Design an enzyme around this catalytic site. Structure first.
Site, PDB file in Angstrom:
ATOM      1  N   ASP A  38       0.855  -1.190   0.000  1.00  0.00           N
ATOM      2  CA  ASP A  38       0.000   0.000   0.000  1.00  0.00           C
ATOM      3  C   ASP A  38       0.885   1.231   0.000  1.00  0.00           C
ATOM      4  O   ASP A  38       1.326   1.630   1.095  1.00  0.00           O
ATOM      5  CB  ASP A  38      -0.964  -0.040   1.173  1.00  0.00           C
ATOM      6  CG  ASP A  38      -1.895   1.139   1.180  1.00  0.00           C
ATOM      7  OD1 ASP A  38      -1.944   1.836   0.161  1.00  0.00           O
ATOM      8  OD2 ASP A  38      -2.523   1.353   2.224  1.00  0.00           O
ATOM      9  N   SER A  89      -0.283  15.483 -11.693  1.00  0.00           N
ATOM     10  CA  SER A  89      -0.486  15.089 -13.095  1.00  0.00           C
ATOM     11  C   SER A  89      -0.662  16.371 -13.904  1.00  0.00           C
ATOM     12  O   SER A  89      -1.197  17.343 -13.369  1.00  0.00           O
ATOM     13  CB  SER A  89      -1.631  14.141 -13.235  1.00  0.00           C
ATOM     14  OG  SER A  89      -1.968  13.994 -14.580  1.00  0.00           O
TER      15      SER A  89
END
EC number: 3.4.23.22
Length: 330
Positions: free
Chosen positions: A35, A199
């Protein structure tokens, strides 16, 4: 040193990926959910409330000659999905794919929430976010990667998740055979303890790329891609009959649909998520309504590049002094 471990979808939907982890001496192999959005290595154990264990492999520290109670240490974690677990802590030898850390904090679950109990395939989590998120009290513990870092040939791990297939977690090296083209590296903020990056935008299907900063985390422990509602609406607008269902808890679409790809920007590079990756199948057995793999982050407070996004890429978690995140097509 290096490690290389295969990570395997727990089911036909890639709901999560489990990676065999050796804990203790002699080894106890548990299948953990690696994770990158949390920083606790916790396991189902001999200490887990018996009613809360249903098929998981448990760590039994008493059977490990190298297990040591970390006296007084406890942990308690609540995940973004409302799941939780808590317990006490052992230190033990932990190996991933041939890479060994002695003295790893192994957080032994006394209690796990129902979603953990109900998932017999996940024996625990191995957190790979920044150790600043580790929940061990009163002495915060390092992640496996943080403990391994100094020994690694390179202070990096890579996530190469499979679409409906096994993939690989590598530690300490970048398999230049595992991706196509170049790796584009992008800045990380560790300010929230995540692999948080920005992004450069997105495209839906063959649509024009929209240049827009999307701050998010690279989170292997999150199944789906959670993006701002504007982006998600733009995506699902391209699927006839797709709708956001409050009853289901997100975008659903007709199982008869062909999904468009979703492209996200990494600097000037583009990662294309094939539309099939965005199909999470019927909301219920036999339903003709399918759950979308691209969902709004609006109710989260953070955008999450989960497995839907990451499995389209070879992802480098660069844990250098200035951490960065590398994405390559594959």
């Amino acid at each position: 040193s290096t490690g290389s471990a295969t990570t395997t979808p727990i089911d036909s939907l890639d709901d999560a990926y489990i990676t065999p982890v050796q804990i203790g001496t002699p080894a106890q192999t548990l299948n953990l959910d690696f994770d990158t959005g949390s920083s606790d290595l916790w396991v189902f154990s001999s200490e887990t409330t018996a009613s809360e264990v249903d098929g998981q492999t448990i760590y039994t520290p008493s059977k490990s000659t190298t297990a040591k109670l970390l006296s007084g240490a406890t942990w308690s974690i609540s995940y973004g999905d409302g799941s939780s677990s808590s317990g006490d802590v052992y230190t033990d030898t932990v190996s991933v794919g041939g890479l060994t850390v002695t003295g790893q904090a192994v957080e032994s679950a006394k209690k796990v929430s129902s979603s953990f109990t109900e998932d017999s395939t996940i024996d625990g989590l191995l957190g790979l976010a920044f150790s600043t998120l580790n929940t061990v009290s009163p002495t915060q513990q390092k992640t496996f990667f943080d403990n391994a870092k100094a020994s690694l040939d390179s202070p990096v791990f890579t996530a190469d998740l499979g679409y409906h297939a096994p993939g690989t977690y590598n530690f300490g090296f970048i398999d230049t055979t595992a991706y196509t083209g170049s790796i584009t590296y992008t800045a990380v903020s560790t300010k929230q303890g995540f692999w948080e990056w920005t992004s450069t935008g997105y495209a839906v299907g063959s649509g024009t790329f929209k240049s827009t900063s999307i701050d998010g985390i690279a989170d292997t422990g999150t199944t789906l891609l959670y993006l701002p509602a504007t982006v998600v609406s733009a995506y699902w607008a391209q699927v006839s009959g797709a709708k956001s269902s409050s009853s289901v808890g997100g975008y659903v679409f007709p199982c008869s649909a062909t999904l468009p790809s979703f492209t996200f920007g990494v600097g000037s590079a583009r990662i294309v998520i094939p539309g099939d990756y965005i199909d999470f199948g019927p909301i219920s057995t036999g339903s003709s309504s399918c759950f979308g793999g691209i969902q709004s982050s609006a109710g989260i407070g953070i955008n999450i590049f989960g497995d839907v996004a990451l499995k389209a890429a070879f992802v480098v978690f660069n844990g250098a002094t200035t951490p960065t995140l590398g994405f390559a097509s594959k």
